[PDB]
C-alpha cells in the first residue's frame, strides 16, 4: 500500500533520529590500557591503587577515576532501560524500513524496460 | 492505508475516535427515547 517515496522518507527520519539518539547516549570505554615504567623492582611493587592514587572502587570506574585526595531509584534506572531500548527500537525499524524499500526498489527494476533473458547485455542507446 | 505516525499524532488519533463514539452513543440513545415515546 505504500510507495517508494513514502517509505524512503520514513527511513530518513529514523536514520537522523537514530543518529541523534545515539549521540545523547554515553558508552563505557572498552579500550585497552598499558603503563610504562622504569625498572623490574618497580614492576613487582606496582598496583593500580598507587599509580592512580585511587581506592579499589574507583580503579574499576575508568571513566571518572577521581584521585582519593579529591574524595576528601529503580524507576529512575528503569527509565534508563527505556532510553537505551528506545534507540534499539529505532535501529530495528530502520532495517525494517530498509527491507521494504529494497523490495519496492526491486519491483521497479523488474518493471523497467530491458532485455531480461537476469538481464541480457544490450547497450542502451 | 498503512502509515506510521508519531506520538503526538497517535495520542490525538485516539481522541477523535473517542469523541465520535461518545456522540454516536449519545445520538443513538436520544433516538431510542423519542422512538419509545
Amino acid at each position: 500500500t505504500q510507495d517508494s517515496n513514502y517509505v524512503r522518507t520514513l527511513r530518513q527520519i529514523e536514520l537522523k533520529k537514530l543518529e541523534k539518539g545515539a549521540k545523547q547516549l554515553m558508552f563505557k570505554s572498552s579500550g585497552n590500557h598499558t603503563i610504562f615504567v622504569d625498572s623490574r623492582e618497580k614492576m613487582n611493587e606496582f598496583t593500580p591503587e598507587k599509580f592512580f592514587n585511587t581506592t579499589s572502587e574507583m580503579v574499576n570506574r575508568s571513566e571518572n577515576r577521581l584521585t582519593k585526595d579529591q574524595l576528601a531509584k529503580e524507576s529512575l534506572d528503569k527509565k534508563k532501560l527505556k532510553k537505551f531500548k528506545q534507540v534499539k527500537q529505532h535501529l530495528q525499524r530502520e532495517t525494517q524500513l530498509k527491507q521494504v524499500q529494497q523490495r519496492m526498489d526491486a519491483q521497479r527494476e523488474l518493471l523497467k524496460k530491458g532485455s531480461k533473458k537476469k538481464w541480457k547485455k544490450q547497450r542502451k542507446r | 492505508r498503512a502509515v506510521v505516525l508519531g506520538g503526538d499524532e497517535k495520542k490525538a488519533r485516539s481522541f477523535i475516535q473517542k469523541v465520535l463514539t461518545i456522540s454516536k452513543a449519545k445520538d443513538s440513545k436520544r433516538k431510542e427515547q423519542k422512538a419509545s415515546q
Partner: peptide, 11 residues
Amino acid sequence: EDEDEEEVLAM
C-alpha cells in the same frame, strides 16, 4: 480519513 488510515510499526 483517519478511518481510512491504518497504523503500523507502533511504538
